[PDB]
């Protein structure tokens, strides 16, 4: 496989903040480590001694739906370095560390988790990274963290709820800028377990359009997860920033 000690070279991706480290027989995806010299959940990481403090961390697509979508080929992921990201469904903070490593020190990641022990893991990794704040609250009630979340630019939504579109609709009505980017990860077996997945995805896209989003891209991230889709949409506009 991609064994420890192999030499890889690290080139930039098409997206900002993401890199692709290619070498030998396996090309993998990575992000620049915010706190160098320590892994979060025991991942392989990439050390380069520049002509020390520079380390990159490998982004598992089978573990995180954002890296699955990036390897599927989204047109954009909306999170440049220095952009505020509201993460909904921040279960234990595995992919939230990579989103925080994307947005860098001058950005901010507001990671909302509902369960408490996942909240403990999230508060530990947000003790390590000083740009992710942890919010242990229910994402169905965004009146709880309206003191904490300012108007963010991107929303990531990886909640597996049947009322997912309403949750994202009220969270984006409260905390998203005009023309706000978001990526929602739809799991068809949790939305509607009886209906076919393409019909489930079209119904969820139509519900987002009723909840005032304008959808611009959609990919079924198929070689990494079954019956999952990632829908990219812009809030209240057609272009992303302005």
């Amino acid at each position: 496989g991609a064994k420890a000690g192999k030499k890889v070279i690290v080139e930039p991706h098409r997206h900002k903040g993401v890199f692709v480290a290619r070498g030998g027989k396996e090309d993998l995806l990575c992000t620049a480590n915010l706190v160098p010299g320590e892994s979060v959940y025991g991942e392989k990481r990439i050390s380069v001694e520049t002509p020390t403090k520079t380390e990159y961390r490998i982004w598992n697509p089978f573990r995180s739906k954002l890296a699955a979508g990036i390897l599927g080929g989204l047109e954009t992921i909306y999170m440049k370095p220095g952009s505020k990201v509201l993460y909904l469904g921040a279960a234990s903070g595995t992919s939230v560390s990579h989103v925080a490593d994307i947005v860098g020190p001058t950005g901010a990641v507001y990671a909302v988790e509902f369960s408490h022990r996942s909240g403990r893991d999230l508060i530990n990794m947000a003790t390590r990274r000083t740009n992710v704040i942890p919010i242990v609250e229910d994402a169905r009630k965004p009146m709880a963290y309206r003191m904490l979340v300012p108007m963010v630019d991107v929303i990531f939504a990886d909640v597996a709820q049947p009322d997912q579109a309403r949750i994202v609709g009220i969270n984006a009505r409260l905390f998203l800028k005009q023309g706000g980017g978001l990526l929602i990860s739809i799991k068809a077996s949790c939305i509607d377990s009886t209906a076919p997945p393409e019909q489930v995805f079209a119904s969820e896209v139509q519900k987002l359009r009723e909840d005032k989003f304008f959808p611009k891209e959609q990919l079924t991230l198929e070689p990494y997860e079954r019956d999952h889709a990632m829908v990219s949409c812009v809030y209240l506009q057609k272009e992303f920033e302005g």
Partner: protein, 120 residues
């Protein structure tokens, strides 16, 4: 400690009947380490955990990985009943029953995880 606890009125026995059906269909992993490895390999569709366990920290460590991977989990109140339903001749405290692309068990799986998602 076990907040998605299953209640009495014909949900525990629906769970254990679906468990026995999947154990006949050979689509079921038994014991805490096998449930953990199945959830971490992502093939799991639902996971049943006993609540009568001597100290409960085992079936407390499994819900963290289940919440991280977003699969449904539910507590049945008897590990002896869970082992009898699986067909083990030992008491089983954790049961994870996986996904396959073509079966008729998956309808029971889907209705069961809809009831479990309503329970949470």
């Amino acid at each position: 400690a076990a907040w998605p606890k299953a209640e009495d009125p014909a949900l525990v026995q629906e769970l254990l009947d679906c468990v026995q059906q999947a154990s006949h269909y050979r689509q079921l992993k038994k014991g805490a380490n096998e449930t953990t490895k199945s959830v971490n390999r992502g093939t799991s569709e639902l996971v049943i955990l006993a609540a009568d366990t001597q100290p409960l920290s085992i079936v407390l460590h499994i819900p963290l990985i289940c919440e991280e991977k977003n699969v449904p989990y539910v507590y049945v109140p008897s590990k002896v009943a869970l082992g009898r339903a699986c067909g083990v001749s030992r008491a089983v405290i954790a049961v994870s029953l996986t996904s396959n692309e073509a079966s008729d068990l998956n309808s029971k799986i889907r209705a069961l995880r809809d009831k479990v998602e309503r329970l949470a």
